[PDB]
Amino acid sequence: APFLCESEQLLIHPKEELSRNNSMVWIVNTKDYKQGVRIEKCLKRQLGKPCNFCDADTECKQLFHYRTLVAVDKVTKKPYKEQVLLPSCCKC
Amino acid sequence: APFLCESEQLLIHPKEELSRNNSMVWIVNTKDYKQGVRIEKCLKRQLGKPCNFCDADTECKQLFHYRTLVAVDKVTKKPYKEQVLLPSCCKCAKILSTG
Amino acid sequence: RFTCPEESEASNCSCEEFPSKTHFYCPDFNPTLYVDVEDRMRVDFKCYDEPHDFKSLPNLAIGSVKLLTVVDCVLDDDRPILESFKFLEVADVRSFVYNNHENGIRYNAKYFEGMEQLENLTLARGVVSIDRDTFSGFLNLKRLTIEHNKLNLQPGTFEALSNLTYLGLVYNGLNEIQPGLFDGLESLEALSLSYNDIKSLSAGSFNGLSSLRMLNLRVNKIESFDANTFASLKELSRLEITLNPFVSLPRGLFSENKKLKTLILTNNRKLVTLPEELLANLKELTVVNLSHNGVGNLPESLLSGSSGIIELNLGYNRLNSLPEELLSDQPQLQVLNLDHNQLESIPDYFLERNVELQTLYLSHNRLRSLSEKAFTKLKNLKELHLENNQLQTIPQFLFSGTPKLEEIYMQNNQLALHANSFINEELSIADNDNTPFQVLQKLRILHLRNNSISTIFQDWYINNLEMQSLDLSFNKLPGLSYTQLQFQSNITLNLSNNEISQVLLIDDLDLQPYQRINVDLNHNPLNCNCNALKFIQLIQSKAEHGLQFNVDQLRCSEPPNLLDATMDQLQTKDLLCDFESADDCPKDCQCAMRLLDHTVIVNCSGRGLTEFPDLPIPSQLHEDFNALEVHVENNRLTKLPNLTKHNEITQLYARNNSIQNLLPHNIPSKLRIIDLSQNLLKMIDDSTLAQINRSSHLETIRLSQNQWLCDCPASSFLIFVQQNSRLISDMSAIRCHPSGKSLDSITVNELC
Amino acid sequence: KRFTCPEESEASNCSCEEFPSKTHFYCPDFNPTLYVDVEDRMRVDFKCYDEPHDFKSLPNLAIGSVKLLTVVDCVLDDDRPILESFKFLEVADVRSFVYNNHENGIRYNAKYFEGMEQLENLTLARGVVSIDRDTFSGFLNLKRLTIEHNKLNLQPGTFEALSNLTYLGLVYNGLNEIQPGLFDGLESLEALSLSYNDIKSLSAGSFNGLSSLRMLNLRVNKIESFDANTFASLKELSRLEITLNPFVSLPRGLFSENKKLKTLILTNNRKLVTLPEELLANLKELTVVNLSHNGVGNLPESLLSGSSGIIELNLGYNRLNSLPEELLSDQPQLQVLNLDHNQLESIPDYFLERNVELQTLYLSHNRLRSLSEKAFTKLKNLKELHLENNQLQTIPQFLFSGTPKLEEIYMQNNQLALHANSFINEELSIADNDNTPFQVLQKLRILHLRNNSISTIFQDWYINNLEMQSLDLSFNKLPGLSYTQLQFQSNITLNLSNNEISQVLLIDDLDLQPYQRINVDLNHNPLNCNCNALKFIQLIQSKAEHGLQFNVDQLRCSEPPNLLDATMDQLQTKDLLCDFESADDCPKDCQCAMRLLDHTVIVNCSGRGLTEFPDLPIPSQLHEDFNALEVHVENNRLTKLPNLTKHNEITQLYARNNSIQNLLPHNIPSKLRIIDLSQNLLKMIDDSTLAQINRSSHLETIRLSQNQWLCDCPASSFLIFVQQNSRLISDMSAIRCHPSGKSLDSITVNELCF
Ligand SMILES: *[C@@H]1O[C@H](CO)[C@@H](O[C@@H]2O[C@H](CO)[C@@H](O[C@@H]3O[C@H](CO)[C@@H](O)[C@H](O)[C@@H]3O)[C@H](O)[C@H]2NC(C)=O)[C@H](O)[C@H]1NC(C)=O
Ligand SMILES: *[C@@H]1O[C@H](CO)[C@@H](O[C@@H]2O[C@H](CO)[C@@H](O[C@@H]3O[C@H](CO)[C@@H](O)[C@H](O)[C@@H]3O)[C@H](O)[C@H]2NC(C)=O)[C@H](O)[C@H]1NC(C)=O
Ligand SMILES: *[C@@H]1O[C@H](CO)[C@@H](O[C@@H]2O[C@H](CO)[C@@H](O[C@@H]3O[C@H](CO)[C@@H](O)[C@H](O)[C@@H]3O)[C@H](O)[C@H]2NC(C)=O)[C@H](O)[C@H]1NC(C)=O
Ligand SMILES: *[C@@H]1O[C@H](CO)[C@@H](O[C@@H]2O[C@H](CO)[C@@H](O[C@@H]3O[C@H](CO)[C@@H](O)[C@H](O)[C@@H]3O)[C@H](O)[C@H]2NC(C)=O)[C@H](O)[C@H]1NC(C)=O
Ligand SMILES: *[C@@H]1O[C@H](CO)[C@@H](O[C@@H]2O[C@H](CO)[C@@H](O[C@@H]3O[C@H](CO)[C@@H](O)[C@H](O)[C@@H]3O)[C@H](O)[C@H]2NC(C)=O)[C@H](O)[C@H]1NC(C)=O
Ligand SMILES: *[C@@H]1O[C@H](CO)[C@@H](O[C@@H]2O[C@H](CO)[C@@H](O)[C@H](O)[C@H]2NC(C)=O)[C@H](O)[C@H]1NC(C)=O
Ligand SMILES: *[C@@H]1O[C@H](CO)[C@@H](O[C@@H]2O[C@H](CO)[C@@H](O)[C@H](O)[C@H]2NC(C)=O)[C@H](O)[C@H]1NC(C)=O
Ligand SMILES: *[C@@H]1O[C@H](CO)[C@@H](O)[C@H](O)[C@H]1NC(C)=O
Ligand SMILES: *[C@@H]1O[C@H](CO)[C@@H](O)[C@H](O)[C@H]1NC(C)=O
Ligand SMILES: *[C@@H]1O[C@H](CO)[C@@H](O)[C@H](O)[C@H]1NC(C)=O
């Protein structure tokens, strides 16, 4: 890991998470692994872990990103099955 | 607070060709707006290699993110699968000197 | 030193103006011979007269210096070169050059008395009938060259001088060979026999060459060989074969040598087949080229046992199919090229055997398609050349195992490629077209100037941030939009001669700072006006932007009025089009309803009947602009309808017609252009003066073809037209019915 | 050859995902916990991000013999072979192994790797507990070994089991101090680096087998002192790099034996203000070295000896004070030097000239005030100089004698007066060019003279140097643009920002060179656009084509009163009136504003001093440079006018604020056309007016105002005729008959007079 902070790379198939307050669109009929995203998770207590080889005021932080959609899956109410508001890379 | 490897994020407009809406009528009505897609890249000084005020690392690299957008194979003909990438984030990674 | 000889009674001299050199006009007693001399470069002279008479020359010996005479200046036969040296005596210079042009001499040992020790030797156009004698005194000899000559060689002629480092025999047209001609020479490692006609390679003809390293057969009409020829020469390093009309090699030809580094087999069309295991375990072999050789098909076992190959080149060769056992023995390879070859289907399980291959060229092959498994174990590619290879499609996971790529030269494509949708099912994802290009992160250069590109893919400006140069000329791209341009890099683009029918550019051009993008648009059937006005002003009167457009050879196509018209001379004021399909116009005329530059336009000049309603179907101006114009002219209306509720218009036209009065209700006050010209106006339109109003829009009444009644009643009409004559577009046409003359010329005293 | 998952359908979990990239695999399907990625027989990258993903239930996977294996924090068996633990994986002969754990530190022994010995690149991180020489003993032909972030301590004999290993490196290992022989058994150690380890101090006993060492790097190892021969114990080291370490001083002659050293780096050596003399002497060779950012106080007279010449030898940010001349003596050559941010008022010159060959040098951010001539005369090889941020106000007449072929110079934040006569001493000796050393500078690529007391601009430089493309000037003392400055025939870029520019003198510079893109910046330059700018105003007014490019929006003319803070867009070139406005003869109550474009002088008076204003001195043509004229009498009652029109050189009259009481066509000028004639009183007319009325000179516009008119027979017909030519009449109704008030057309005259 020639990078700054330890991180976790996961490929979870999320069940309920939305940019708005409603993930029910994705709580029904996602049982054939319709989607999978290589979500990166920072090391536990990222704030308590400033980057190695440095002592900057900015320690490792994890940001977010989105992915909307229009695709028609095998369920009725799927305005966009692609997940939005997803955590992003960890860096100082 | 500023962070190492300042990077520029962009909302790219989705496909506005709209199957060439000028196929049968040539009066545009595509003036609306859609959420687009957010992509961040580190072109600070065209990827200024020393990525931080803290220095101690003169190289930061943009990182894609592959997503397995399908395993359903709902076509009922084949196990259709697909991987899609995009430069989701950029980060600093130290190198190893010759010495 | 003696670069400028002195002038004296016995023999004067004249040193020409040269530092450390001199045009030796020293004799100067007659312009019979002119000499050119440097400190050590040359002493050759323009001996105009064939008889030199060096005795009648100042005979200025300066000792052994590397300068010599080679041109046109000869001596009589049976004479020691010292007699030729009469003008300048030397002490066995290691450099001797001479090029006999007029004739060819036996070059006798008796003739060669005065120069014996030598390193560099040159003979030219002669050396006929020379014994094994002249070589005796030429000790420590290293270099010998033969120009265009003609003589068969006696075997073992040069046995005295085994020290010759370099040999030159080219242009001699060497007829035949003998196993034993050169066996008295061991230090000879440089050798070339181009411009010769050696029929066959005599068994061990090159024997007795202990240290031979360079061999050059370049222009050598040879068709027959033998393994014994190269059996004894294991010390040979690099060999070259060129222009030899042999059909095939003997088996076991090359395994004898070991330190074979480079091999060249260029230009042997007769060469059609190769013996199996030709390159049997020669690790020294690094570069081998067989370009432009009519080789039929490659035998599988050819390169087993050798892995040091770095460059493998086949050139324009007739090879058809490749056994998989050609990369097996060569884990390390740098460059591979198979160009202009009838090969049509690369075996899939081929390239796994190497990792470090860097380039590839399959130009003008017949590659119907490519398998995904080809690129499993390749992480060094920087180029790729598939120009006109009969491709049809690209496997989606073609570049999965090739991320190190930098440039693709797909180029001219005597073939087709559906570049519309890799994945467009109901299950498809609109994030990015799943083209194999997403993997190629560091890709920078790509060309498809001939392929059947359906359209542009998004990922190029998304997943390929290193894109620099791209061409799509002579392709099949229908349209273009700004959303297909967000590349954020200085990229030149060539889309000319593509079927670009229309383009859509937003007026608010957003660019990354210093984003110099240049696009070539010429010979594209471009529809105009429609959604192009923003683009039109973007290109026409383009002041300064990061976007540049090679549009010199472009012309409007769709608008018949603007047929083939240059865009630069064209302007949006000329541009209008209609694609809303509304039935608003009465259809009894031209009945425009188009949007002429953000302005609804109506042109009912199509033979409008008299008293035809001006606006039988006014536009609601929905989703558009209320600026409206009406054109009903050239139409006989001796009386207009002159009745129309206030309608959002700014422009009216009525010519080749007439009027008798006007209604204030008929005329909205948002009007700017009212024609009322070319139409008779005899009667005094008194109500108009009542309806004369300071309208909001810039009134431009061109009241013309009027023949009023110049008199006291409503004579204030002159005051009306004179108080604001700027509004009055024309006053001369006002020429009263009794006296037809401009009203301005008629005063009140004339009126009353 | 190819690899496939045996039974992907055996369990609902443990789903297989095969691509040409890698046979991706993970046991939990929708939310994987274990992860496995093998590409092809070369690299098996996998992880177990959580303990419950137990390898005990993991299905056997026919892993081929790969050359690289990576394990990321996966659960590890206890005192058992790694391969035995991973019986479900069948990698036969792996060549390199990696391990990194976010938790579960483990004591290390041989039994963990008894099956894994044919390996070259072993590396552990974050979990090393104890070595005890057990594991490392049973290895053979190891290529690289690395430990990282483990906070561990070692016995000296631990590594001595394996004598030979190409490379070893320890980072964040948290060693208190090096044991005297910690890596004693080293024979093949080409390079070792201990970057992050707060070592207490160094002992020579820790250094053994030094022959193999070629490189050594230190980053943050918080040491304070060193043994007298710990580094002198060897010479085979080629590169040495120590940084960021709290050592206050060094033993002298610590590297005399180490004569085979090539490269040394000592940067940000905090708490280090002084160095021992002769320490770097006898250094028979050295490729490069930098000692910057160390704040070294003072140096020995010649620290280095024995080396034929080094390249960098930089000491920037070391805030040096005194520079002995005796250094550089051992170095006949050196490429580049930097001494920025050093308390240097003036270099002793002979130290500098000691070397002849030289590339770019930097002396900026220093307290440099004086510059001796004899510092560069023999400096034949030289590149750009970085000397700005120095208290410099004078320079030698010709100091670039060694290197006339200098390319760039950056004199900023200095106080170089550089007046024209400041250089030029013998006025008649030199005429075109002052004795600026620019004559020596036959070329100068880029010059940075912004922020300096630039009193004078020198056009001779364009002749002194002919290779000049980007000139940097700001905060300069130039009063205005200089004549004949565009004459360089090259794409010079220039800046005039925050420079006291008031007038543009470029009409004498008006000359266009083919294929030239000249550039100037116009920022915070107090332009007085009143006079001598109209030609420039129009030149910049829609400059369709010009070799010179401007930055006008950054400028705004302010000096003229009305043209205050007026950028060009605000500015209208037609209102530019020359500032002097002083014919020295115009009335005090009056003003004379000559218009350059109109060739006229605005004769505008003031004060309404008297009704009978005498005629202005029209014959004064402003030194014959303005023949045409314009009379614009402002705020004045008028009764006196030029009888017989002694001044025909005017076509404009104002009559503003006039109290008129008379009229005479002879009094009315003929060539006068544009006459406002406000505040009128005429109730009559003389028929000779039309005879005088002839608009040949210009449009005879008239605007009768406040006018009492008596409409009667002679004047009515006259008004009819004039209305026939009413194109020169401001308003017909302006007649407005004082008794009645009506229109000329409405009235008939027969009833009035019959
Ligand atoms: C006979 O001809 C051979 C032709 O190769 C001469 O060998 C080479 O001659 C050159 C100059 O004549 C020698 O100088 C070389 O010049 C090149 C070009 O400037 C330079 O790059 C080399 O570093 C070298 O200075 C060269 O040393 C020599 N030998 C080689 C190339 O192996 C030979 O000198 C000629 N002898 C006589 C007696 O004429
Ligand atoms: C693409 O083409 C553009 C032309 O529009 C090239 O412009 C160059 O852009 C860079 C930064 O993007 C400029 O560097 C900086 O410029 C500013 C102002 O000029 C200066 O103050 C900075 O110190 C720095 O030098 C560069 O000057 C500019 N060059 C021009 C306008 O001639 C750009 O190089 C091309 N390539 C890319 C990757 O954008
Ligand atoms: C175990 O460690 C050794 C070093 O002790 C590794 O050998 C080195 O491997 C790297 C990359 O794997 C090589 O880097 C490449 O070198 C070529 C040489 O020209 C260069 O062109 C490339 O740009 C790249 O830098 C390096 O050369 C190589 N060492 C030597 C002496 O060749 C070895 O790879 C490690 N084991 C594994 C499995 O990686
Ligand atoms: C340290 O020694 C070398 C590298 O310096 C590594 O290779 C080992 O070299 C020794 C010779 O000093 C070999 O011992 C003998 O080698 C010959 C020929 O290889 C063999 O026929 C004998 O039976 C005997 O083994 C040793 O085998 C060889 N081992 C390997 C794995 O190459 C050595 O691995 C380094 N490390 C150690 C712990 O020796
Ligand atoms: C020629 O000289 C006369 C002096 O008689 C100048 O007249 C002066 O013009 C200025 C123009 O700024 C007047 O100031 C402004 O006047 C307007 C008038 O309504 C007022 O609204 C503003 O608030 C401001 O006060 C000034 O009053 C006026 N003074 C007189 C005595 O006439 C005239 O401007 C000169 N011509 C030039 C400079 O071209
Ligand atoms: C080839 O070169 C060798 C030397 O490289 C020549 O041998 C030398 O001959 C001279 C002749 O008198 C002797 O003085 C030397 O002692 C000899 N040296 C060696 C090493 O043998 C040999 O004569 C040359 N052959 C020729 C010119 O045919
Ligand atoms: C551009 O592409 C076209 C077709 O895609 C090429 O035209 C012909 O293509 C067929 C394909 O089977 C060939 O058999 C013909 O020989 C081609 N004709 C010619 C004249 O080449 C055309 O060659 C391509 N042009 C370029 C410059 O690549
Ligand atoms: C110019 O140099 C002076 C010298 O002290 C400095 O104070 C100033 O900040 C510099 N910059 C400007 C814009 O004056
Ligand atoms: C200077 O700019 C002009 C265009 O303004 C260009 O033609 C010329 O080539 C440039 N100068 C050089 C040396 O390139
Ligand atoms: C001249 O005097 C009149 C009379 O009051 C006044 O209305 C007018 O404004 C004055 N003109 C000027 C320029 O002051």
Author numbering:
A (entry chain P): 6 to 97
B (entry chain D): 6 to 104
C (entry chain B): 32 to 783
D (entry chain A): 31 to 784
Kindly provide excerpts from the paper associated with this entry.
Insect Toll receptors perform critical functions in both embryogenesis and innate immunity. Toll receptors are activated by a complementary family of six cytokine-like molecules called Spaetzle (Spz). Three oligomeric states of the receptor were observed at near-atomic resolutions, suggesting that Toll5A is highly dynamic in the presence of Spz1C.
We observed a ligated heterodimer of Toll5A with a stoichiometry of two receptor ectodomains to one Spz1C ligand (2:1 complex) at a lower resolution (4.2–8.4 Å). Nonetheless, Spz1C adopts an asymmetric binding mode, reminiscent of that found in Drosophila despite the lack of sequence conservation, in which chain P contributes about 610 Å2 and chain D, 280 Å2 to the concave binding site. Chain D of Spz1C binds extensively to the dimerization interface with over 1,300 Å2 of its accessible surface area, while chain P contributes only 180 Å2, confined to a loop that protrudes from the convex side of LRR14. By contrast in our cryo-EM structure, the β-wings adopt a very different conformation contacting the Z-loop in a pincer-like grasp. Loop structures of Spaetzle1C and Toll5A intercalate, temporarily bridging the receptor C-termini to promote signalling. As there is no possible contact at the dimer interface for the second ligand, we propose that the asymmetric disposition of the receptor chains is the molecular basis of negative cooperativity in the system, where binding of the first ligand in non-saturating conditions makes binding of a second molecule energetically unfavourable.
